[PDB]
Design a protein around this ligand. Structure first.
Ligand code: SF4
Length: 553
């Protein structure tokens, strides 16, 4: 196999036998074969749009297909086989439509040679063998490979955010069109300038999509607000919801109301505690456990059903006993785990089996006590603008350090905890995404009522951090956003974090420190241009980085 899309890739070069995340060869190869079929759909879909007869009937299929190949999202080979079969039928429908339109507009049959992604077909028995030759290493030129895979990696992060927006009824034609433009581009031989322009266009589409999901979440469930979140436990059985989907949360809360089953969040569902629509339920206890990578022991000790709305779902350890109470939904899949089917249009998912099972389980084991404060998304921070600006003017807040992003299991990530603990006491950390678990359970206190850690939400809520920076740029009359007293020390893990990075680069942010390692999908030549154009830097020592950031460098 060959996969290098996440920060934990083997030796920081690529996983070739079994992923470091646990992804076996057969699963990795099936994901490559699905991406190949998605490229075939994109070739014809792009041509139909160019002929003036666009077909958007595969929009949700493409977002879901891409999302299913994100790190820790779907482990069920049967799901990938079904998606590949369905994708082939969808592609052939587009091909037949294209051939007739082409003939009508040109007066002759289409006859130009097409990449194999547009024409290969087979039943499920042929998938495993075909998958071996259509993976990442099929691109021999290392720079072309780097730019194509960087585009697909950023694109799948954008696809995940666009899928959550779509779930809530929010869509923009430019996003779905770009999915096919970007996928089809990877079957073409393009210049370096054209390839880099597509990556920058993906960053601009990450801005669009992150703004759209921000709109969808806040319009539907209200603007996040300051909230104290309990991290201890109650005395009833509960259901633990993890991942990122807030519509699944809305439905789970409604269905569990009055049942005697409590609701707890986990991981990237922590921000559901900040939304006014969800704070109205007394049976919503709080947040359980820590980061996604600690879930084996934490899902075990939770004792009740666990619902994964999105990644990250980690394979069970041999000794784990919670498979019978593990539930997947949306694009998540796991062999042996019960899956909750998609809601009908205008309807709701059915979580009745989780509630019935939860009533038979003991209450969660208390693993810690106390609280976490958060809810500093853009509306909430802009409502406190006068207070924040006065604190900056007085010198009470010397600098903001953006430490948003996605966490992981490598030991080198203690760097983020150590940066948080050693930053001067007149600095404020801005966060979003599971990177927050490296420093959100400390006692950093506050500066005149403003907490030293301001959690805006999920990784997608890095959007709020950009909105805040743009507001401060205007307030302080600065010509360049980089001249604010703000440093960027971002942790990344999977493809949504890469989409956030591309959005920040499109927004003109320079000098970002990215860690704890730099992506394996950046070839030496591609890495050099990113350094040249954007001044992206690796992390250094805690002492060196703190000193440099405090000097604005
Ligand atoms: S998702 Fe990450 S750890 Fe898993 S196979 Fe790919 S690069 Fe390796």
């Amino acid at each position: 196999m060959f996969c290098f899309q996440c920060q934990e890739t083997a030796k920081n070069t690529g996983c070739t036998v079994k992923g470091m995340c646990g992804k076996p060869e057969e699963t990795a190869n099936l994901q490559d074969l699905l991406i190949f079929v998605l490229r075939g759909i994109a070739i014809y879909g792009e041509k139909l749009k160019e002929l003036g007869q666009p077909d958007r009937s595969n929009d949700d299929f493409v977002l879901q297909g891409l999302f299913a190949t994100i790190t820790n999202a779907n482990w069920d080979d049967a799901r990938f086989e079904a998606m590949i079969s369905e994708g082939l039928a969808r592609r052939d429908k587009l091909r037949n439509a294209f051939l007739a339109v082409y003939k009508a507009k040109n007066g002759k049959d289409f006859s130009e040679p097409l990449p194999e992604a547009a024409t290969w077909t087979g039943d499920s028995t042929a998938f495993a063998e075909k998958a071996k030759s259509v993976g990442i290493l099929a691109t021999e030129n290392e720079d072309v490979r780097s730019l194509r895979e960087l585009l697909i990696i950023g694109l799948k992060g954008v696809a995940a955010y666009a899928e959550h927006a779509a779930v809530l009824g929010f869509r923009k034609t430019e996003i779905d069109e770009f999915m096919l433009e970007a996928l089809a581009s990877t079957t073409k031989d393009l210049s370096v300038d054209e390839m880099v322009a597509l990556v920058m266009k993906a960053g601009g589409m990450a801005v669009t999509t992150m703004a759209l999901l921000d709109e969808a979440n806040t319009t539907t469930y209200g603007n996040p607000e300051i909230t104290q979140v309990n991290i201890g436990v109650g005395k009833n059985p509960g259901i633990l919801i993890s991942g990122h989907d807030l519509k699944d949360m809305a439905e789970l809360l409604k269905q569990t109301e009055g049942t005697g089953v409590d609701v707890y969040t986990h991981g990237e569902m922590l921000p559901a505690n900040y939304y006014p629509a969800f704070k109205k339920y007394p049976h919503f206890v709080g947040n359980y456990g820590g980061s996604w990578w600690q879930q084996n022991p934490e899902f075990e000790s939770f004792n009740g059903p666990i619902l994964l709305t999105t990644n990250c779902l980690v394979p069970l350890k041999k000794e784990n006993t919670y498979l019978d109470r593990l539930y997947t939904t949306g694009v998540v899949g796991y062999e042996g785990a019960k899956h909750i089917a998609d809601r009908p249009a205008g309807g709701a998912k059915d979580f009745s089996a989780l509630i019935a099972q939860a009533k038979k389980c003991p209450p969660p084991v208390e693993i810690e006590t106390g609280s976490i404060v958060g809810g500093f998304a853009h509306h909430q921070v802009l409502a406190l603008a006068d207070k924040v600006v006065e604190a900056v003017k007085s010198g009470a807040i010397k600098r903001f350090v953006v430490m948003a992003g996605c966490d992981g299991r490598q030991k080198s990530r203690s760097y983020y905890t150590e940066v948080a603990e050693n930053l001067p006491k007149d600095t404020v950390i801005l966060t979003a995404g599971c990177a927050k678990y490296r420093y959100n359970k400390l006692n950093l206190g506050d500066i005149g009522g403003i907490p030293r850690v301001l959690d805006a939400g999920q990784c997608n809520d890095s959007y709020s951090l950009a909105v805040i920076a743009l507001k401060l740029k205007e307030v302080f009359g600065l010509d360049d956003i980089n001249d604010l007293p703000v440093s960027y020390d971002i942790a990344w893990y999977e493809q949504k974090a890469v989409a956030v990075l591309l959005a920040l680069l499109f927004l003109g942010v320079k000098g970002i420190r990215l860690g704890p390692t730099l992506p394996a999908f950046l070839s030496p030549n591609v890495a050099k241009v990113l350094v040249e154009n954007f001044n992206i830097k690796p992390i250094g020592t805690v002492q060196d980085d703190i000193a440099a950031m405090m000097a604005g460098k």
